[PDB]
C-alpha cells in the first residue's frame, strides 16, 4: 500500500503539481528538476528542466520516460532528444508531447541516468501528468448544474470521500485549488453558501467524460466531504482521489 517514509522517494513533491504546472519537482545535491506544461483538449506539452548544481559538467545525460503497459494504452507520450552534456551551473530542456487516449490512474516514471565526477548517477521520480490536466471547465447556471447532477444513473459513477483536512481551511485557497485542478468553480449554486461546486469535461481521444463535483467543509471536525459525479466510474474515482489530497 505504498509504505515507508516519503522522503528521498520517487514522489516527495508529486502532489504539488496536481493543481499547478510549474515548479521544482525534484532536487538532490547534484540535480534540480523543474517543470512547466500546458494542456488543451486531450493533449498536452510538458517541458522538463534539468539544472546542474555543480561546478562540473554531467555526461551522457539520459532522461527516459517509463510507463507500465496499462498506462501506455491510455496515455501516449513522445519526446525529443536532450543535450547529453550539461555544464555545471547549466540547464538543459526536454519536451514531452502528451496525448490522452482514455482515462488513466497511474503516473509515468521519469528515470534520469548520467555521469558525474567519474561515477554513475541514477534518479527516478514520478511524473505529474494526471487525469485532471485534461479538463475543459464548463460554466453553467445553477438550474443547469442541478439538472445534470440529477442525471446520474449507475451508483458506481458517484464517488464520495470524507477525509481530514491536511491544510488549514481557507476559502480563497480552496477556491484557488479547485480552479487549479481544472474544473469551473460555480459561484452560489449550492444553497449552503459554505460549500463549493465545480463542473468540467475530461477530454480523451476515445471519450469525453462530463464531470461534476461538490466539496463540503466541516470546520469543527476539520474534515471535508468531497463528491464526484461523472459519466465514468473510473474518472469519478481518480478525480476524487486526486482532489482529496489537496486539502
Amino acid at each position: 500500500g505504498s509504505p515507508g517514509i516519503r522522503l528521498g522517494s520517487s514522489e516527495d513533491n508529486f502532489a504539488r503539481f496536481v493543481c499547478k504546472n510549474n515548479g521544482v519537482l525534484f532536487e538532490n545535491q547534484l540535480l534540480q528538476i523543474g517543470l512547466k506544461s500546458e494542456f488543451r483538449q486531450n493533449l498536452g506539452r510538458m517541458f522538463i528542466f534539468y539544472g546542474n548544481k555543480t561546478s562540473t559538467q554531467f555526461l551522457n545525460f539520459t532522461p527516459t520516460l517509463i510507463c507500465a503497459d496499462d498506462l501506455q494504452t491510455n496515455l501516449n507520450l513522445q519526446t525529443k532528444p536532450v543535450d547529453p552534456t550539461v555544464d555545471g551551473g547549466a540547464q538543459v530542456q526536454q519536451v514531452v508531447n502528451i496525448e490522452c487516449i482514455s482515462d488513466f490512474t497511474e503516473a509515468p516514471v521519469l528515470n534520469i541516468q548520467f555521469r558525474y565526477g567519474g561515477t554513475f548517477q541514477n534518479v527516478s521520480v514520478k511524473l505529474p501528468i494526471t487525469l485532471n490536466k485534461f479538463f475543459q471547465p464548463t460554466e453553467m447556471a445553477s438550474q443547469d448544474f442541478f439538472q445534470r447532477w440529477k442525471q446520474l444513473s449507475n451508483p458506481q459513477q458517484e464517488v464520495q470521500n470524507i477525509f481530514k483536512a491536511k491544510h488549514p481551511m481557507d476559502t480563497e485557497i480552496t477556491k484557488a485549488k479547485i480552479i487549479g485542478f481544472g474544473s469551473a468553480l460555480l459561484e452560489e449554486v449550492d444553497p449552503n453558501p459554505a460549500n463549493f461546486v465545480g463542473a468540467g469535461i475530461i477530454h480523451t481521444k476515445t471519450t469525453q467524460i462530463g464531470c461534476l463535483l461538490r466539496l463540503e467543509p466541516n470546520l469543527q471536525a476539520q474534515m471535508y466531504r468531497l463528491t464526484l459525479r461523472t459519466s465514468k466510474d473510473t474518472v469519478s474515482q481518480r478525480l476524487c482521489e486526486l482532489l482529496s489530497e489537496q486539502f
Binding site: 510549474n22 515548479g23 521544482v24 539544472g51
Partner: peptide
C-alpha cells in the same frame, strides 16, 4: 510566462 523554477 511562469518560472519553471518557481514552485
Amino acid at each position: 510566462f511562469s518560472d519553471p523554477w518557481g514552485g
